[PDB]
């Protein structure tokens, strides 16, 4: 809906990921059946019946046979299972089986947070990473023009009133990056920012 509708597609499209974008999915995403092309997808932690709770990105580099998992909070698999009841165990298996000769795969997932605890900007952070992936499929997590704009923070420090200013800045940079490269974002700024604000989910 407002906090990133399934129109991360429009933005993803604007960012030039079109030739690699499989689309938006819910927890049921099967995996990658693409042993020859770069593919990427924005997956939700929940089933469509629920409406969606957390957006995350998956990317596949057949050349290096590595699968990228970018979930904005950098949560451990243990905490992913707990907080969101999500597991990407079957999709990895499928992906190795369907896309790799030796049925092996290297998983590379972020271990740091770039998003604030009360922020509803997850879907947007995924689009920014997919831009990084499309342009630098060998080093998308860091060390590239796009991701150098934001700073990762050890997950244990997510709620620390100390790194909060780094996390709000990250989001300022997010918004401006989309502003620069996305006609759709530009023509929808007020709506998107307000729908995905840094403090959007703060308790009252």
């Amino acid at each position: 809906m407002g906090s990133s509708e399934q129109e991360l597609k429009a933005i993803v499209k604007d960012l030039g990921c079109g030739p690699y974008f499989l689309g938006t999915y819910d927890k049921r995403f099967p995996g990658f059946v693409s042993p020859h092309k770069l593919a990427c997808a924005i997956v939700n932690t929940a089933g469509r019946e629920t409406g969606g709770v957390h957006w995350m990105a998956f990317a596949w580099n057949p050349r290096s046979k590595t699968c990228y998992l970018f979930e904005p909070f950098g949560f451990s698999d243990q905490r992913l299972k707990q907080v969101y009841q999500f597991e990407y165990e079957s999709l990895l298996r499928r992906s190795a089986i369907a896309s790799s000769p030796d049925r092996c795969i290297t998983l590379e997932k972020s271990t740091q947070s770039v998003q604030g605890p009360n922020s509803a900007a997850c879907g947007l952070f995924c689009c920014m990473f997919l831009h990084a992936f499309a342009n630098w499929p060998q080093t998308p997590m860091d060390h590239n023009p796009t991701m150098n704009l934001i700073t990762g923070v050890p997950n244990s420090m997510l709620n620390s009133p100390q790194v909060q200013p780094t996390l709000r800045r990250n989001q300022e940079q997010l918004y401006s990056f989309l502003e620069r490269h996305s006609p759709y974002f530009r023509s929808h700024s007020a709506q998107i920012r307000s729908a995905t604000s840094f403090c959007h989910l703060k308790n009252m």
Partner: peptide, 11 residues
């Protein structure tokens, strides 16, 4: 950017 973790996975 963010730090990542690489794991080999064979099935």
């Amino acid at each position: 950017g963010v730090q990542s973790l690489k794991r080999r996975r064979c099935f």
